[PDB]
Ligand binder design. Structure first.
Ligand SMILES: CCCCCCC/C=C\CCCCCC(=O)OC[C@@H](O)CO
Ligand SMILES: CCCCCCC/C=C\CCCCCC(=O)OC[C@@H](O)CO
Ligand SMILES: CCCCCCC/C=C\CCCCCC(=O)OC[C@@H](O)CO
Ligand SMILES: CCCCCCC/C=C\CCCCCC(=O)OC[C@@H](O)CO
Ligand SMILES: CCCCCCC/C=C\CCCCCC(=O)OC[C@@H](O)CO
Ligand SMILES: CCCCCCC/C=C\CCCCCC(=O)OC[C@@H](O)CO
Ligand SMILES: CCCCCCC/C=C\CCCCCC(=O)OC[C@@H](O)CO
Ligand SMILES: CCCCCCC/C=C\CCCCCC(=O)OC[C@@H](O)CO
Length: 200
């Protein structure tokens, strides 16, 4: 009852593609910029860091806020958390309000994980930092951090409902990165920071 409302709410909230909304407000088409994706990284390319960080936090809250409610109302070990977390990410990836063409789910999924375990969220972000500072590819860092998030939850002893949530979310995130992976493998993935050292 209240739980089915929470899952539907999570999917519909997730289905608000904030990057596209703010881009439209600014008169920019995100599909014509950079990677053509609609999440915070390509928002930064199209609109600047201010708007990318804003979209990061909105996409994060899409996952954090419903999952937090599931955690406090039903428990981390409830399949209501599993379905609320999945609904958030599935709405972000396949938004009912935007032709089912969404983002890749990194920020939203981090929000879900933060609601379950701030420590696991921190560790996964630490993995992300290392991989990003090393190779300067957002995609490579997100893929590695996504795999690590699942290992962290597995090794820390979280229950099956959480591991089910994490392996489906994780597999979906990696699959949504398949074009980045093809670019990585062929050497035309966008890389950060090479020319900026001439201005430092
Ligand atoms: C296109 C994919 C559709 C598949 C999703 C189908 C619905 C998935 C999960 C069920 C929604 C949440 C209901 C949970 C619920 O009411 O549990 C709480 C209650 O039983 C007592 O805690
Ligand atoms: C346990 C306490 C710390 C846990 C850390 C969990 C994750 C929290 C913060 C990291 C997010 C940084 C937000 C900025 C960011 O990445 O913006 C997206 C980027 O596209 C902007 O250019
Ligand atoms: C030795 C010090 C290690 C590095 C310290 C890191 C401090 C923690 C967080 C910094 C916030 C960065 C959030 C993510 C971010 O902005 O990604 C870079 C972005 O430009 C990629 O598109
Ligand atoms: C339908 C939600 C609309 C947006 C509301 C956003 C609220 C975000 C964070 C505050 C949540 C507070 C805790 C909610 C909860 O499940 O509490 C249960 C328990 O702590 C007391 O019964
Ligand atoms: C499953 C647990 C509760 C969450 C239910 C939310 C509904 C889930 C997914 C939305 C529909 C699935 C999207 C199918 C798909 O990929 O279609 C192709 C797509 O790229 C559209 O062109
Ligand atoms: C198996 C579930 C995994 C859920 C979390 C997966 C990712 C975990 C940590 C990495 C967070 C990186 C945040 C910084 C960043 O730039 O993120 C990518 C950005 O485009 C926002 O989506
Ligand atoms: C560092 C280990 C990460 C393991 C998980 C990520 C594996 C998934 C996709 C990556 C496929 C291509 C590997 C990355 C790559 O080619 O990077 C470009 C490289 O030549 C130098 O930046
Ligand atoms: C437990 C399974 C959950 C299923 C949810 C959806 C899973 C979809 C794909 C599995 C992950 C593979 C992603 C990596 C991948 O295929 O990258 C290769 C890509 O370059 C192919 O063009």
């Amino acid at each position: 009852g209240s739980a089915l409302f929470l899952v539907i709410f999570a999917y519909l909230l997730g289905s608000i593609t904030f990057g596209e909304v703010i881009a439209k407000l600014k008169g920019v088409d995100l599909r014509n910029v950079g990677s053509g994706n609609v999440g915070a990284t390509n928002v930064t390319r199209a609109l600047g860091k201010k708007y990318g960080v804003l979209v990061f936090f909105l996409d994060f809250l899409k996952g954090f806020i419903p999952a937090l409610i599931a955690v406090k109302s039903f428990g981390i070990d409830s399949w209501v958390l599993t379905f609320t977390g999945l609904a958030s990410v599935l709405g972000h990836m396949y938004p009912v309000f935007f032709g089912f063409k969404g983002g890749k789910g990194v920020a939203t999924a981090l929000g879900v994980v933060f609601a379950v375990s701030p420590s696991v969220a921190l560790f996964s972000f630490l993995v992300w930092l290392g991989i990003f500072l090393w190779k300067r590819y957002v995609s490579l860092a997100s893929i590695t951090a996504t795999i690590s998030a699942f290992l962290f939850l597995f090794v820390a002893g979280y229950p099956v409902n959480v591991l089910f949530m994490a392996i489906v979310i994780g597999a979906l995130i990696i699959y949504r990165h398949r074009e980045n992976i093809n670019r990585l493998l062929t050497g035309r993935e966008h890389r950060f920071g090479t020319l900026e050292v001439l201005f430092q």
